[model samples]
Structure formats: structure tokens, C-alpha cells
Target chain A: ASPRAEQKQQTRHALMSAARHLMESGRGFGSLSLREVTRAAGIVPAGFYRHFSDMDQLGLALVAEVDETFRATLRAVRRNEGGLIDASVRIFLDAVGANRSQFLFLAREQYGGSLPIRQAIASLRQRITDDLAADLALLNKMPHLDGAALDVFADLVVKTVFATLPELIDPPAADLPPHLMPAAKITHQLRFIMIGGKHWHGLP
Target chain B: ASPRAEQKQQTRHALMSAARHLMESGRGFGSLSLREVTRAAGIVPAGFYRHFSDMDQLGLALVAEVDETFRATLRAVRRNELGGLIDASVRIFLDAVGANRSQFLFLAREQYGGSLPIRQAIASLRQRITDDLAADLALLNKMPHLDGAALDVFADLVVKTVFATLPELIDPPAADLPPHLMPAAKITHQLRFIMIGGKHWHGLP
Candidate 1:
């Protein structure tokens, strides 16, 4: 790539990283201002528009970056082949710990953030759900679950895992020197869902 | 009761109800101001302290009111056990939503938003639900698996599923809604939860 193109990409990464940094320090997406982001990125305020039309655009880009990172990590782990739930839980915890800012961005917005950011995260989850459904289909474990049932089953699996994330990432202050019980519980939670699916006989 | 005492009780109810109204209107508990709540309650700003000491206290009171409402609704549903887990849980959830939309709205907002005490209250209430559900699981006719630990695990799954679906129940999808927003699909998903739990109860893996 040309130097100019490479330079623009580098600047863009700086701005996104700056936004994530601020949010990690406990600022909401809607509360962040353009000047602050630009200042943190060490660029002139005018240069903000060179990469993002506005703050919402930058926020969406951050969500996309996180989503891509997660998908790539999951794909790498998908290549392995033993005790799927155990492997999945370990890999997921590692990825979340590795990318705290990205996961926090996704989690905070997924519950309460600006419309665009929430939409982006929701879409990311939907894609994950769809991919999980396809995997379940390939496994041929729950033959009776088809169509809406399979989709719901897949969704439950994804959401159950997602719900456990906040506690895993940010335990309460009292739970200092955090233990793995929550993590283990998450593993059992996933297993229960799968075991339940094993015996699902479709809609009665 | 004396008229003066009765009047004080009514005013307290008014202030709490007004708080709920603002929250239901899309204001977070942390964002609500004393003046606004008092104004909505039709009382003077100075009179705000007559009912509660501070905003955090008021928020906790609101959480308590909702907790009581939830417990009452769950009790009403629990009395009728003919349909078993699936039907009972769905009814209980719907009844809670219908009876107290305001409470659920506040809950969905404060749950992940600011407000330390409010978040702590929510966490406590959630833990109670998990415990109660575990007790119910202990009483279930289905065979148990892996003792109390597994029961708590199953209860956590059910409660988490219920909690995830509540926001969708209260907030309808709008123009701004993402195309992927699928609240209706969650019901089927919950049914699948019950199905899976039932299957797991019979067979340990």
C-alpha cells in the first residue's frame, strides 16, 4: 500500500484506540466528544473527518473491529477437536481477557448505548447465533429441533454464554482474587443447554 | 388511622409512583433529579425528604416495591401447578410484565447503567430468584443429577434466560431497531430452555 494510505490507516487506528481507552475508563459512547478523541489520538480536530464522518461512525467501526477479532479467534479455535464445550469456554475466557476493551464496548452498548452502536452489536450477535446454528446442524445432535426451534436453541446457547461474560470480565469488588467458580458455572451452563438439546423432541 | 397519618402514607405512594412514571418514560434512575420527581409527584422540592432521605434510598425503595410485586405474582402462579415448569414460568413472567411495566423498565435500565446501590439491589434480587428456582428444582419429580451444584447451575441458566427476555418484552422494536432484533424468537428459545433442562434432569452427562 502507498505511504499515504498506510498513514491514514494508522491514524484511524489511533482514533479508535483512543475511544476504546476512554470508554474503558468508564465513559459511555454517547458521552464521548470528537475533540477529546482527536486530542487523544494526537491529531488535529479537522483530521477526525478524514476517517470518520462522525462519532457514531467511529463507534460502529470499533464494534466491527471487535467483532472481526472475535470471529478470527473463534475460527482458530474451531480447528481443534476435543470436548467442544470445555475448549470453547477456555478459548472464550482467554479471548475476553485479552480484549477487555472490545468486550466491554460490546457489553455496555449491547444493554445501553446509542442506537447505532447497539444495532451493530445486535447484528454481530445475530451473526454469531446463525453461525452457531449451522454448527449445531452439522453436529446432527438435535435432529428433532428444526427451523425456529433450532434457531431458538442456537440463540439460547449464544445468549447464555454472553450473559456470563460481564461477571467473568468484571466481578464485584468483594470477590477480590476472583476464583474460577463462575467460569466453571459458565461451562456447566453451556453443557446443560446442550444436554437439554440432546433430548428435545421438537414442539409438542 | 388518623387522617394526618393516612395523608402521609398517600403522599409517599405518590412520590414512588411518580418516580416509576419517569423511569417508564425512558429516564434512568441515576439520571432522575429530586426536583423532577417531586414536581411530578405534585409536591414541593423541600417535601422530597419527607418521603425518602436521598435518591439512592428512593431507588432502593423502588427496587423493593418491584420485588414485592414480583414475589406476589410468582406466588399466585405457583399455587396452580397443573401445567408444570414451562407453562408456570411463562405465566409468571407475563403477569409480572403486565402488572408492573414500570418496574421492569427501571430494572432493564439500572441493571447495566450507573447507580451502585441500584445495581447491587438488582444483583441481590437476581440471586434470590436463582435460589428460589433451585429450591423448586429440588422439589421436581424428575430425577436429579450431580446434586445441589447441578441444580444451582440449571437454575442459573433458567434465570439468565428469563432476564435476557425481559427487556425485549418491555421494549418493542422501533424504526431504529436493528433488523436482527428478534424478541418474538426469544419465547421459543425459552421453551427450548425448559425442554433442555427437562432432558438433562433425566440423564446426567
Candidate 2:
């Protein structure tokens, strides 16, 4: 921490904090204006450029920043004791592990003229999302969102997370992270939507 | 079909909508007792069986409603005469993939197209899929999002970004990489990118 570096870093963080507050309040990242954020950060409009190229970059930087924040929380929680859908995450990946052969058959048939098979998978997936949304509601601590809103959230959460299948089956051999388990990453994303996103109002 | 069928269909719809309304509030479908929905419908709990096998089925029915709801949000979003928040909301829905249209595009391309990539990874199916993609891009009129990118190069890039992992998926460790989840996490991130790339950037860049 050299003086200049530390000072720049502090300002960068302040900028991030102000942006997240805006998001948590309900302004989606896309709607945030640069000057708007700068004022909130207690900085001149031009000063923001020194820190970020534009609002989008800052929005993304904020996303990454919040990830580290919640991601660290996950590590800390593990360091102590905690959970959120860890069991669900485990079961989902377990199913992925268990059903590779049948799913491949399903995947193979999922494409071609196998509308029947695809629809069969579709119906099956619908049940999973249904079960997930129902369970998500049951868990409580949901923000001031409606059921339809939660359903849509759960639906996309399923889409995004169920997207785990190909990777679970095929597996990437590229550079990996410390928490290396797929379920671990999946858990963080789900928690992020709820705890961090607070119904995606905190979407960063 | 039959008068009986019409009556049964009407009853089933009432059950589905009531369950959807329940979920629309805050009670999860899972927590809703059978009698609860039937009560909401003014039907006896026993009558619930005439429609769904269980509450789970009704929840599944509600999920279908989400697809309908989300699709409308997308259409409304498309017509909103804005982008920033509209785009965020639109992309979020697109992330839901409520998108058989583009999913079909990827599936169709990847099916025959995968045949080529498999061999290429074995030391071979790039150009053919690339061309097919180029043609698909050139022919599509509604894809204003892709206007700036060069078709051939863009198509090739997509084919490559998606296909690069082909070899790994088709071929897996017999032990299933049981050590942990490196491959699984990586692939999920990649598909997440594709969903956004195709649909949002969900496909563009």
C-alpha cells in the first residue's frame, strides 16, 4: 500500500459502494448515469473517468466487487458454520453426476425430430423449477417481491444453474479456482440472487 | 372434445389459476395444502384429484404461466421505447431462455454441427458449421443486434467459442472427474455467457 495506490484504491471502493447503493435502491445498472453516480460518490463528474471508463464498466466492476464480498462470506461462513441451498446444490449436481448416461441419451434426442423426448425433458425440467420455486418460497426471508416475480427469478436461476449440466458432464480441464466444486460456485450464485441481489435490485 | 371433457377442462383451469394466484402471493405451492387450493376454488379437496395428481403438478402448471408472463414482459419490454433498464430486464428474461427460438438455433446447429467439431478435436468440423452459421446470420432479418459484426468472422467466433469445449463434453473421464467440479463450473460459466451472448450478447459478440 503505497500512498497513491492506497488512495486510488480507496476512491475506487467508494465509487463501488455508491453504485451498489443505487442498485439496491432499484435502479438497474443500465439506467445509472455517470454523473449521477459521481455525485453520490461525492466526487466531481470528471473525476469518475479517472476511476472508470463509464458507468457500464463501473457496474461490472461493482458486480465483480460484490461477488468477492459475498464469495468471501461463503468462505467465512464455511470457516464458521452456515448454509443456503447447499443441500439442493449438492442434490442437483449429484443428479447430474448420476444421470450422465440417460441424460446423454436425452441430450442426443433433445435435438433432432425427438420432440417427444425433448418435451419429456421439458416437462421434467418444469417440475424441477416448480419444486425449486416452491421450496424457495418456503425458505422465507424473501424480499418484498411477488410470487410471479419469485417464479421468474427461480425460473432463470434454474436456467442459469441447470446450465451446470454440460459442464458437470463434460468438465472443463482449464484453469480452475480454489473452491473447485461446481456446487460451491452454484451455491454462491443462488445466494447472490437472494442475499446480494435482494431480488436483483442488487444485481451487481 | 366431449361435454364432459369441456367441463373437466374448465375445472382443471380453475385449479391451475388458483394455484398460480396462491404462488403470486407469497405461499409457495409446496406449502399450500391440497384443501387450500380447492378451498380457494370453492371445490372440495377431494375434487383436486380430478385435476392434478398432487400439488407438485399444479406448481409445474404455474411454471408454464411464468413462461407466458415472462414472454409478455419481453414483448412489452421490446415495445417500451427504451434500452437501459429495458435491456437489463430483457436480458434477465432472456437469461431465463424462455427461448426455444434461439435454443433451437443452438441445438440444430450443434447437432449436425457437433459431428464436425468432434472430429476436428480428434484432429478434424469447423468450416462447415462456420459456413452454415454464416448463412444463418446472413439470412436472418430480425437480428439487428448483430449488424455491426462481420458475419463470417462472427459466426466462426461463435462456433469456436461454443465448440472449443466439444471434445471435453463428448469425452469424459470414466471416474467422472470425481476429484471435484472444475469442468462443471467452467462449462456452466461458458453456457451462461452463450445464453447472454446469443440472446443479449447472449449471442452477438
- DockQ for each of the predicted structures, in order? 0.34, 0.02
Record all residue pairs in model 1 with backbone atoms less than 3 Å apart, i.e. clashing: A196-B196
Estimate the lDDT of model 1.
0.70
RMSD, each candidate, Å? 4.4, 24.2
Which stretch of 10 consecutive residues in model 2 chain B shows the poorest summed lDDT?
Answer: B116-125
The C-alpha interface RMSD of every prediction is 4.2, 20.4
Q: lDDT per residue, candidate 2, A128-175, as tens digits?
A: 556655665765556554565455555556655554444454444465
RMSD over all Cα atoms, model 1: 4.4
Candidate 2, CAPRI quality class derived from DockQ: incorrect
- Quality class of the docking in candidate 1, CAPRI style: acceptable
- Model 1, range A33-67, lDDT digits (tens) per residue? 89999999999999999999999899899988856
lDDT of 2 by residue, B42-62 (tens): 898999888788765664454
Question: Residue B32 error for model 2, in Å?
Answer: 50
